[PDB]
Design a binder for this molecule. Sequence first.
Ligand SMILES: *[C@@H]1O[C@H](CO)[C@@H](O)[C@H](O)[C@H]1NC(C)=O
Ligand SMILES: *[C@@H]1O[C@H](CO)[C@@H](O)[C@H](O)[C@H]1NC(C)=O
Ligand SMILES: *[C@@H]1O[C@H](CO)[C@@H](O)[C@H](O)[C@H]1NC(C)=O
Ligand SMILES: *[C@@H]1O[C@H](CO)[C@@H](O)[C@H](O)[C@H]1NC(C)=O
Ligand SMILES: *[C@@H]1O[C@H](CO)[C@@H](O)[C@H](O)[C@H]1NC(C)=O
Ligand SMILES: *[C@@H]1O[C@H](CO)[C@@H](O)[C@H](O)[C@H]1NC(C)=O
Ligand SMILES: *[C@@H]1O[C@H](CO)[C@@H](O)[C@H](O)[C@H]1NC(C)=O
Ligand SMILES: *[C@@H]1O[C@H](CO)[C@@H](O)[C@H](O)[C@H]1NC(C)=O
Ligand SMILES: *[C@@H]1O[C@H](CO)[C@@H](O)[C@H](O)[C@H]1NC(C)=O
Ligand SMILES: *[C@@H]1O[C@H](CO)[C@@H](O)[C@H](O)[C@H]1NC(C)=O
Ligand SMILES: *[C@@H]1O[C@H](CO)[C@@H](O)[C@H](O)[C@H]1NC(C)=O
Ligand SMILES: *[C@@H]1O[C@H](CO)[C@@H](O)[C@H](O)[C@H]1NC(C)=O
Ligand SMILES: *[C@@H]1O[C@H](CO)[C@@H](O)[C@H](O)[C@H]1NC(C)=O
Lengths: 99, 369, 49, 414, 204
Amino acid sequence: QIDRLITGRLQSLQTYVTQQLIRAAEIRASANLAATKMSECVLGQSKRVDFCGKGYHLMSFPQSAPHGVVFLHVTYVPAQEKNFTTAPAICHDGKAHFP
Amino acid sequence: DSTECSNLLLQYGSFCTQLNRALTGIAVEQDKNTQEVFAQVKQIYKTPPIKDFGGFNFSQILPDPSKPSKRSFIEDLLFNKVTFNGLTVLPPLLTDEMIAQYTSALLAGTITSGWTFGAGAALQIPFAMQMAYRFNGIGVTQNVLYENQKLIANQFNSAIGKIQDSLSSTASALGKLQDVVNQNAQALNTLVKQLSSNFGAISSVLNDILSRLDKVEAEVQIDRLITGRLQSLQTYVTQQLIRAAEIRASANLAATKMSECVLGQSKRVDFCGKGYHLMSFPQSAPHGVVFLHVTYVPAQEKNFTTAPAICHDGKAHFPREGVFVSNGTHWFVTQRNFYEPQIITTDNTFVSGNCDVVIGIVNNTVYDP
Amino acid sequence: DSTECSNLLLQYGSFCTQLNRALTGIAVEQDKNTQEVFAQVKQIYKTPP
Amino acid sequence: TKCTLKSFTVEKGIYQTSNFRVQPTESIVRFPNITNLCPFGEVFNATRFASVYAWNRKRISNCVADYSVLYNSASFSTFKCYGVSPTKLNDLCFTNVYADSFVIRGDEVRQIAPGQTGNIADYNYKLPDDFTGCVIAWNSNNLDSKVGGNYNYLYRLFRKSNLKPFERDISTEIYQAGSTPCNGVKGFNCYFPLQSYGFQPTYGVGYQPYRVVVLSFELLHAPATVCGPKKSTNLVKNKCVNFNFNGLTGTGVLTESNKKFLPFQQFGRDIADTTDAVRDPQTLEILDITPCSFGGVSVITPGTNTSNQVAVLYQGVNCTEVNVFQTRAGCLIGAEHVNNSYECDIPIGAGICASYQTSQSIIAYTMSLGVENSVAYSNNSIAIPTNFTISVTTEILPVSMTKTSVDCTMYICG
Amino acid sequence: AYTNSFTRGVYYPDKVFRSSVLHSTQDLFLPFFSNVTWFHNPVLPFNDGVYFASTEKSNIIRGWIFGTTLDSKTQSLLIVNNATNVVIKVCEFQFCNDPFLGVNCTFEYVSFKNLREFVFKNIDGYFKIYSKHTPINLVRGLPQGFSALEPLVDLPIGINITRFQTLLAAYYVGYLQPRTFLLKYNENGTITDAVDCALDPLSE
Ligand SMILES: *[C@@H]1O[C@H](CO)[C@@H](O)[C@H](O)[C@H]1NC(C)=O
Ligand SMILES: *[C@@H]1O[C@H](CO)[C@@H](O)[C@H](O)[C@H]1NC(C)=O
Ligand SMILES: *[C@@H]1O[C@H](CO)[C@@H](O)[C@H](O)[C@H]1NC(C)=O
Ligand SMILES: *[C@@H]1O[C@H](CO)[C@@H](O)[C@H](O)[C@H]1NC(C)=O
Ligand SMILES: *[C@@H]1O[C@H](CO)[C@@H](O)[C@H](O)[C@H]1NC(C)=O
Ligand SMILES: *[C@@H]1O[C@H](CO)[C@@H](O)[C@H](O)[C@H]1NC(C)=O
Ligand SMILES: *[C@@H]1O[C@H](CO)[C@@H](O)[C@H](O)[C@H]1NC(C)=O
Ligand SMILES: *[C@@H]1O[C@H](CO)[C@@H](O)[C@H](O)[C@H]1NC(C)=O
Ligand SMILES: *[C@@H]1O[C@H](CO)[C@@H](O)[C@H](O)[C@H]1NC(C)=O
Ligand SMILES: *[C@@H]1O[C@H](CO)[C@@H](O)[C@H](O)[C@H]1NC(C)=O
Ligand SMILES: *[C@@H]1O[C@H](CO)[C@@H](O)[C@H](O)[C@H]1NC(C)=O
Ligand SMILES: *[C@@H]1O[C@H](CO)[C@@H](O)[C@H](O)[C@H]1NC(C)=O
Ligand SMILES: *[C@@H]1O[C@H](CO)[C@@H](O)[C@H](O)[C@H]1NC(C)=O
């Protein structure tokens, strides 16, 4: 009778440890992403589009949270456009000027 | 649905609930992956009726209005080339028609407005000027595009033509997507085939055990089929949790190539394909995404003699942008990534120190305009 | 390598085949990992004398 | 849903609470047209019959034994089956049966039992003390009886030792009753072994002739060539049924099919062993088998801290099997179908989402991907921003789990 | 004498329809490219079961006997074609030491330009028979090609067999072995091709 409880409880504990090893690999991927966001967004200024929030990245600030990290990403968003006529180059004395 | 077995399976407790909770977690991740790759765009941008994109021809990658679903020509090639024992497949949250509306929105934003639709509201810009600022982003001066615009457009249109031929030549091009289909089919056929196995029981047919034997003898045999079929499911669910972590690692990479290659211009070497990256276009495929990465590759080099600096009146001059080269005898300054030689001048160059310090300096004239 | 055991192991069905197929997937992937890292380069460049 | 979550408060979402399954509406059993009935009627309707010292036998084999043709008939003055009840014989199987058959006076029928003793049992036909099979008998004074006596029927009165179970002896050898020599002929102390009842129409029932047949069963290493006949039901198409064709049990919607089995083939299988068709064994058409409809049942709910309404999705089920609305994800019950589109509140699948909205009720709609925007592109027009907004965007990432450790020896045993 | 079997002697392994599929099964098959014993007659062993074939349209090859003694002491199968159909009995016959046709009991039954092929095997008290009849263009060897034998009868006789003989112009004999075969079923559900998994490393 006890071998049935040992078998069931041991297979129940192997199922938990298997799912925790898989969940630890998910959280390790998230912790490596968070460590990378701290190196590149906080300690630097990233040019990687949408890596440090929407808009062009200016800086970000780390705040701690239970079991995690929270970044306040500060970004420049361009906000009041106008339509203009445009040209690739300007002709002057028969020669093309480029901006 | 045999009641004699079902009553025994209750004694194994919460195993069956934690299998369904695990497979439900995987099923939610597949919609979250599909959302994070394609739904990066705040509005469904659409291309104008006119197609004056400076001679570049996106017709093979823009939506086909005549198709039964609004997929592009290349998205139809990609959708053609990939090809009940209590098991149910669930549908995706986004249909393949909604995925093609997102690749259309991303592509129509990219063509009409460049990087700007990632950073804010899409700002129109003429396509030749967008490509001029994508050239200027790889250290090739923008006039190298405008002076060669018909050549660059013909090379782009030709290179898009080769993608149709490549995708038509063999289905083995889509190998990563077709493998991800074949593994899930292989896993389900294995899960179903394991119902035929005995696991040490008298017979693998559950109603047959219940016919050959009386109650307590039948119960001892059914507990072997319950053990073996429960172990068969736990093996499949464990294998799908590992395979889903592998697909999530790929979906996070596709979501990153969406943000960095499509919504912008990457400087990460060989991230958005080989060569210096100009732009890329997303096309949907069954269970995945295809990026057409457009890149500048430098192609016809010449050897030149070079110097790190030049002397003038004892002043050592260095190039502001570019590098010094000799046309066998004369000295010129060129941009680094394309041979465009100019006379060396006081505004092509800057001065630091004097001729004593620099190793390998040469004597010439700097023209003061 | 006992036949009296091997005939019982067949009654468990596809478990043995999928364990060999899983470890073969581990083994083939190691050469992919090593090619992806080092074989970035198209030609075997040499330094001058 | 409250019971599924082990909570009295339910947050907003879609929760799988149950599995729907169409139950089998009736049971079907099918076997080939019942044929090759065992020839018991050749014995029980015979004009002649055997003397009990030399009983008749026939090896019944390769046939269906309809024992109900026997035990339903009130003609039999005795019908005792040993080891088994007579009605169960229409279910069982045997290697052979033997019709061990004879005539005796009605009183000596009491000797036809397992392990009996007396003239018939010991000297004419012996049954073992653990017999299995049916003793059957009836009065035959209408057939076996004659004016002045029918002396043609005989039984053995004398033998030196008893016949073993199912043993037989025809010999007219003289019974030597002492040291007196007999030389193979009748005399004093030298008596003839076979004697007659001399059946007369005036006899009382204990002296009247009875016909007897003992159906001796056997089961050997050779297969069970004799079986009780299997009954068959009517056949149903386009309904969920429990079924059994020959030995192949299942449960499914049987339909007609265009599949062309070869003339010897009986079952169809799909790629992964699952049965996909059967030949009906009476009219040789190929029935497709498809499983009875089943799927997850999901409860779409706003949070209980906002409303007590719900809508229910039968995932992958057609509404014909179950406002009522057919989505591609399943039959959706209790949600209003709406021709507008919105952002997703609660996801259903295949482009459908549902939400709690305006009087407020659950609505279900095709999800909206975003506002359409024809960008104002032209070959000479550029848009340039005249102003900006600094924007602060919170991004949240998990970094570490709770550090569990377990002593497995204390968890398992303790 | 002997000849090579090529790919002859496959039979439908079970009463199951399958279509446009490749199915792997282990059963008593004739191994591919094995030798078959060739004859124009002697008593032969039976082993696990026998493939038999002949070039025949004269019906001089009339029948077979199967058993242990094939004579009086114990039960013995007699199988004969009567020039209209097959006739079968299993009684303990006191027949000759070498019988031929001019040019208690427990069961009985009644049913060149061509090759006639047969398989006989005995399992758990059932004597299985399979056959096929097919046109040919060759006098000497078995016809190099592929077609599968179909079951005729499934006789529940409950008898042991170790030897057999043929009641009498080529005929050929080969013993079955517990090979694994991969069988190719077309849209009609006919076995149109097969691979002997033990033959060579390509077939593995
Ligand atoms: C630019 O031009 C388009 C032409 O349709 C117009 O819709 C839009 O309002 C104009 N102004 C801005 C700021 O985009
Ligand atoms: C674009 O390419 C397709 C296929 O080569 C061609 O049919 C179409 O005419 C091209 N469009 C333009 C504007 O050249
Ligand atoms: C450059 O010059 C050297 C001279 O030795 C020669 O080996 C090399 O092939 C030349 N390369 C090109 C691109 O002309
Ligand atoms: C470059 O050098 C050659 C001699 O080395 C000379 O003939 C030529 O005029 C110079 N200028 C240009 C633009 O080639
Ligand atoms: C350049 O290299 C050659 C060969 O190593 C040497 O002869 C020469 O002196 C070097 N010149 C300078 C300026 O380094
Ligand atoms: C450069 O010119 C100066 C005189 O102006 C001379 O002394 C020096 O040797 C020259 N150097 C070279 C590399 O020719
Ligand atoms: C069974 O009996 C019916 C009587 O109508 C007949 O149609 C059918 O062909 C018979 N089937 C067999 C297998 O004898
Ligand atoms: C949700 O619960 C809190 C605490 O019970 C309550 O204050 C709040 O009013 C509830 N929400 C709504 C929409 O009523
Ligand atoms: C649902 O079931 C009915 C009856 O079987 C059928 O007519 C209909 O086509 C099925 N499908 C849908 C989506 O209604
Ligand atoms: C929804 O659209 C269909 C098709 O146009 C129409 O029959 C139906 O009446 C509409 N219902 C509502 C509530 O708009
Ligand atoms: C720019 O936006 C701010 C508010 O963000 C507003 O006060 C200001 O008037 C706008 N225009 C200019 C030219 O600053
Ligand atoms: C197989 O048969 C051929 C003649 O057809 C013969 O030469 C060869 O020796 C035989 N081999 C075996 C192993 O019987
Ligand atoms: C079977 O073979 C025939 C040969 O003419 C063919 O017409 C038919 O399509 C095949 N399949 C079926 C299921 O009959």
